Amino acid sequence: FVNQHLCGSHLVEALYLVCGERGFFYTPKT
Amino acid sequence: FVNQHLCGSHLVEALYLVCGERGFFYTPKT
Amino acid sequence: FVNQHLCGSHLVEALYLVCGERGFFYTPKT
Amino acid sequence: GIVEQCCTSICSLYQLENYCN
Amino acid sequence: GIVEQCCTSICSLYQLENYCN
Amino acid sequence: GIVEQCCTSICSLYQLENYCN
Numbered sequence: 438f439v440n441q442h443l444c445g446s447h448l449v450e451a452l453y454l455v456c457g458e459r460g461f462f463y464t465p466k467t
Numbered sequence: 468f469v470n471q472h473l474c475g476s477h478l479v480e481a482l483y484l485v486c487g488e489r490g491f492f493y494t495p496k497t
Numbered sequence: 498f499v500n501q502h503l504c505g506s507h508l509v510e511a512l513y514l515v516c517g518e519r520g521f522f523y524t525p526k527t
Numbered sequence: 528g529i530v531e532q533c534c535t536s537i538c539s540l541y542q543l544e545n546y547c548n
Numbered sequence: 549g550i551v552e553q554c555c556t557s558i559c560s561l562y563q564l565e566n567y568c569n
Numbered sequence: 570g571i572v573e574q575c576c577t578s579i580c581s582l583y584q585l586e587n588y589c590n
């Protein structure tokens with residue numbers, strides 16, 4: 438696997454693929 | 468709901484979700 | 498058809514649509 | 528317009544809704 | 549190449565078609 | 570955090586995996 442530059446919705450697309458049915462948390466800095 | 472930073476195709480993805488079966492017009496400045 | 502500004506995954510989405518079942522090669526500069 | 532506002536600044540879903548048919 | 553051209557500049561669908569199999 | 574790292578820098582799929590449930 439390679440490293441990624443991921444902004445915005447692309448980050449959540451990546452989490453979706455990495456985690457699959459495990460699900461995930463999307464937690465930006467506030 | 469939160470405010471959005473949307474460029475390029477991301478804008479049309481957002482319109483698709485907001486409008487659903489109502490449909491929408493995508494009208495960039497020319 | 499119009500010209501395109503395509504970065505990252507947007508490029509592969511475009512190739513997918515242009516090529517369809519023909520398939521395609523995604524070949525970034527190394 | 529809306530396309531430019533959303534990209535150069537930010538926009539709300541309610542502003543986007545003005546473009547629904 | 550095409551990947552870099554499309555991102556740094558612009559490209560056409562016909563230029564992209566050169567990458568179909 | 571991870572959201573900011575992936576966008577300002579780069580991140581791996583293994584770093585992302587820390588956010589799976």
Ligand SMILES: [Zn+2]
Binds near residue numbers: 447477507
């Ligand atoms: Zn994007």
